[PDB]
Amino acid sequence: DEGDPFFVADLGDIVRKHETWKKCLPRVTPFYAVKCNDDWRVLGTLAALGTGFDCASNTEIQRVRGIGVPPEKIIYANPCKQISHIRYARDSGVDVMTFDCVDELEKVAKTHPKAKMVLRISTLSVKFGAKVEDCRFILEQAKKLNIDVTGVSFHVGSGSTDASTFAQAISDSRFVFDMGTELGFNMHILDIGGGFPGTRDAPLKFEEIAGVINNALEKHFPPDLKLTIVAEPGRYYVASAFTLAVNVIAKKVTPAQSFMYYVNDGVYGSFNCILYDHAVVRPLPQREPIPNEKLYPSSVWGPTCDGLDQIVERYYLPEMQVGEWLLFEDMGAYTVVGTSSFNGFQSPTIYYVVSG
Amino acid sequence: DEGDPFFVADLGDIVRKHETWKKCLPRVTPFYAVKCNDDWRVLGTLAALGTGFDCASNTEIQRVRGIGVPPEKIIYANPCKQISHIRYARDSGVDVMTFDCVDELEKVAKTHPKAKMVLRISTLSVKFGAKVEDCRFILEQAKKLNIDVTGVSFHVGSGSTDASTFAQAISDSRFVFDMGTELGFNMHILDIGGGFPGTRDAPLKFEEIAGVINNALEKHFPPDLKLTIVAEPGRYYVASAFTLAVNVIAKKVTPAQSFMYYVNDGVYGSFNCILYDHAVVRPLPQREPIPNEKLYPSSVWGPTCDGLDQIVERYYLPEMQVGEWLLFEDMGAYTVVGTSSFNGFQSPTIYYVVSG
Ligand SMILES: *Cc1c(COP(=O)(O)O)cnc(C)c1O
Ligand SMILES: *Cc1c(COP(=O)(O)O)cnc(C)c1O
Predict the structure, then answer these.
(1) Domains: count for chain B
(2) CATH of the domain at A44
(3) Which residues pair with B53 in a beta bridge?
(4) At CB < 8 A and 24+ separation, what contacts does B218-224 make?
(5) Nearest CA of chain A to the CA of B224: how many Å?
(6) Contact call for B127 and A80, based on CB within 8 A
(7) Which residue among A219, A281, A326, B345 is least crowded, i.e. fewest CB within 10 A of its CB?
(8) Do B82 and A249 touch (CB under 8 A)?
(9) Domain that holds residue B312
């Protein structure tokens, strides 16, 4: 008994993803954003395909060093680091960090003085990113601190509706790159960040994005042996690789006929993505559709005792039975990584497949 | 170095809270809601003051049995339980569960047939609670299933502005109580739920609520040796016992003068309460106020790489320095229990004091 929830993860989906990356963005070396999903098999698979890693804390630095990815394949791309975490990266070989302001540079001068610093420009956030107005002052201050500033990076953010933002960002990157060189800094890295779609049927497809990037790149950043273009794709690699199966643990009928299904993972667990990632989810019954079937408005609710722990407000389902299974596809990204064990509940075991 | 964040927890605040409970609600035996905060010291202190426990899963049932609380001090107050979790509670001596619908009673008939079932009525939620219109049918179905229905419960929810709700709820509980008796059921438990304030300066104070409850109680549920009144207070006991100190790990100045403070816990961590609990928090500087001090609009931001990980949008603060400490009071409730280690960050160690 105990029909516990579980993920099937398809590591082959990760390989196919990489294959397309390489074909649509051959100038660009991906540093996987480990905060997306840091499952050990997903890390090892990506390590094996020869991906870089984008890590955001000492813990993520340890985990990828744990699988014997050398330091050079890691960018520590967190603009605001605790000073001891910098210390750690300095002790692990990790030397490329980012920053977006001068205060951090002062930290860096005092803690990791030969680090290769990448300057991140706003694009995404009030939280992160230098405005391009402030870069000259920033870069003059960098000079007084004797910082080795070696490139520019931005981060369009995880749901653009127009690809132009990349193109805008890249142009902006050329301007600050140029101030970089003007003031004597050895600028040779362009990091175009994260945000690509990880489900191959999003509205704005990966391929358009790759095309606008490539046109921008050719116009502002002509190939050069001194220049490396890099990115920090997160959901790209993993969104659609993981599928969740959840058991309907409880059932309510309202007499019009509507159903309430209670399942055994929810917004404190894998569906935290509804709260923190703006995710919308589609419940699929794993029983195969039966010809003519009656379908009724349904809510599905997670196991916790909280009224806000709700996964779906009104979705057409066949009449379901306690002990049956709902599938949610595309549950690779920002899903295991945000879970909590609020209320006693424990998160889904992961099972792994290789689509050969 | 590594100015890690940490909680000071004052177990004596728990004892004081218990003393007040007993003085203002002497007819009522509290079953602490362990999902609120299941820290081992908070459980052991409550268990020693002689509290009951409200548990919602097999894990919370284990934890409180782990500290040698016998089964009878446990109510398993989750209306919609996974059938193997029922099985567990049956194997651990836990026999009082609740329910709000007939579907569950079918499960209970099949899994834990001699269980003392408490019927929970809506009050709180679309998610939980039987409408009072449906209780007669519900209770007739219970009888067919041979359920031992032994009482009524409700749950006003965690932030009422008028205490009348309890009074309303209690009246309603008398109605379903009375159908219970009419149909041959041994009704002797009234569980008035959770929702009381846990900071002794909320707008609607504990004491008004205790007064409305007691009036309602004396009017609809006169003292009787056969009747036990019970409750499920969660934040009551712990909200104000815990104080969070967080290190400012990063600083931004905007030239009017405003500041951005980045600290090393945030909404994937102890401030998940902003997202899931409707919490508002007040950042206090731990340096003592200096006479005349200049104060400026400030945001404080959590360590994570997400733009939505923001703690405070505009709060007046003295100018702060990297390496200083912000204190957040009242951070007992729905704070450690929701945390995740999104992005590599690890949650605050807790330190314990006894206000003697
Ligand atoms: C959040 C993040 C990423 C990854 O975002 P995706 O949309 O998953 O590709 C990459 N880089 C930085 C700096 C980020 O914050
Ligand atoms: C959430 C909950 C509680 C405790 O809520 P508080 O506001 O912390 O007192 C008690 N009982 C049930 C059934 C709950 O869902």
Answers:
(1) 2
(2) 3.20.20.10
(3) B32, B74
(4) B220/B170, B220/B171, B220/B173, B220/B174, B221/B170, B221/B173, B221/B174, B221/B177, B221/B190, B223/B27
(5) 31
(6) no
(7) A219
(8) yes
(9) 1-11+238-356
